[PDB]
Design a protein around this ligand. Structure first.
Ligand SMILES: C=CC(C)(C)OC[C@H]1O[C@H](O[C@@H]2C3=C([C@H](C)COC(C)=O)C[C@H](O)[C@]3(C)/C=C3/[C@@H](COC)CC[C@H]3[C@@H](C)[C@H]2O)[C@H](O)[C@@H](OC(C)=O)[C@@H]1O
Lengths: 226, 8, 216, 7
């Protein structure tokens, strides 16, 4: 029963065993029933913690590899070893987003849909972070659509003070900056997000102020140093 | 810190 | 694969938190039956203690969640799963110690010997942290015997300010407090260690010392 | 923690 599976995921979150929480949330989303917003966030941050651990470790052991006869072969093997783990978890959650969580949202569910599409774009960006040449272009395309579509959708059905829309705009801006290597478009979208957001600071709800104000502030920050 | 949204 | 390559693998795995990989590489480093350097022994200890400490911390938060509460069968199954993982890694490090490290210590390799016996007592205390009934009595007795031999060699052939002796004394106090529920004996052990170390490395004694003012 | 940590 999912009623206790979500509780197991919450217990794993409390236990900082993010693999177990991501597994429980994978089970509850494989049960084909639609996901609550808090269960949405549970699965999202569980899987993002799981992949970000390997992201950080990959960063450190590839930075030292680029910094530097027989040990360099082993550090390259280790980088490939955890790269085949990062890509594995990425594709796992990507097919979780394709077979479920997207086909299970009608037109009246714009919010959840752009949530999952930003998830898809983020994980494809993480895949492109470790891809080279022919393996890169493809995912850089698969991210782009998965981003842009999402953008368009909530440019049509929710005001730019929503934390989900602002988070999608922020991840899109840093995708344009880091991967697409286009600081112009990144700065542009950061500006169109933050300005449109502050234009209606009235709509900041009592239960959504912290998240938005944070994301708007970090969008502004990224805009400063660029 | 990190450019992207640090989602815990 | 050359042993230096494995040592580098686990040294860099510490910079990546792959403490499972660190512990595995250093376990395979101990499994060539050659005694370890100070650095290699220390980072083996670090890796294994880090993984068992993750297990311990999340087990503790699970057991604390298990108290203030139906849907508890799942909580108990999760706690037992964490317990199984914990005692698995504990039996792994204990079998490493008994078969390779404590045995390759000569009858007067004093510092390394007391180090490994304090480690054995620590991991048996970790086993007792989650053990039940007589299965708990046996492991607390084994930890007591390990700490006993370690403390004998600590008092006789060692300086009363040696950080290894001080660490054994601190963990012996923590064992007597958190396992035997005898704060008298724990405070007494800590007091004797501190009052033998004051005569003449710093942090650790303060650590022991910091425990004293936390119990008084 | 109360014992001897990271060692
Ligand atoms: C359900 C609780 C869990 C899963 C533990 O956290 C999910 C979090 O979900 C909400 O915050 C979300 C959001 C978080 C906020 C940005 C951080 O909250 C604060 C005050 O710091 C962090 C999470 O990663 C999360 C859910 C991510 C999303 C992102 C969707 O990615 C797929 C788009 C923006 C952001 C939205 C969904 C935010 O609403 C809530 O406002 C948070 O409440 C608190 C205490 O901050 C809660 O922690």
């Amino acid at each position: 029963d999912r009623e206790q599976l979500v509780q197991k995921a919450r217990l794993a979150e409390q236990a900082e065993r993010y693999d177990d929480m991501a597994a429980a949330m994978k089970n509850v989303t494989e049960l084909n029933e639609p996901l609550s917003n808090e269960e949405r966030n549970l699965l999202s941050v569980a899987y993002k913690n799981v992949v970000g651990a390997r992201r950080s470790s990959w960063r450190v052991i590839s930075s030292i590899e680029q910094k530097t006869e027989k040990k360099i072969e082993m550090v390259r093997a280790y980088r490939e070893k955890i790269e085949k783990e990062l890509e594995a978890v990425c594709q796992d959650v990507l097919s979780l987003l394709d077979n479920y969580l997207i086909k299970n949202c009608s037109e009246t569910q714009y919010e959840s849909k752009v949530f999952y599409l930003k998830m898809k774009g983020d994980y494809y960006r993480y895949l492109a972070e470790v891809a080279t040449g022919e393996k890169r272009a493809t995912v850089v395309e698969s991210s782009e659509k998965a981003y842009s579509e999402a953008h368009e959708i909530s440019k049509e059905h929710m005001q730019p003070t929503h934390p989900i829309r602002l988070g999608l705009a922020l991840n899109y801006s840093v995708f344009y900056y880091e991967i697409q290597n286009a600081p112009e478009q990144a700065c542009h979208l950061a500006k169109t997000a933050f300005d449109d957001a502050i234009a209606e600071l009235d709509t900041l709800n009592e239960d959504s102020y912290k998240d938005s104000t944070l994301i708007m502030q970090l969008l502004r920050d990224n805009l400063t140093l660029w | 810190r990190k450019l992207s949204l640090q989602e815990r």
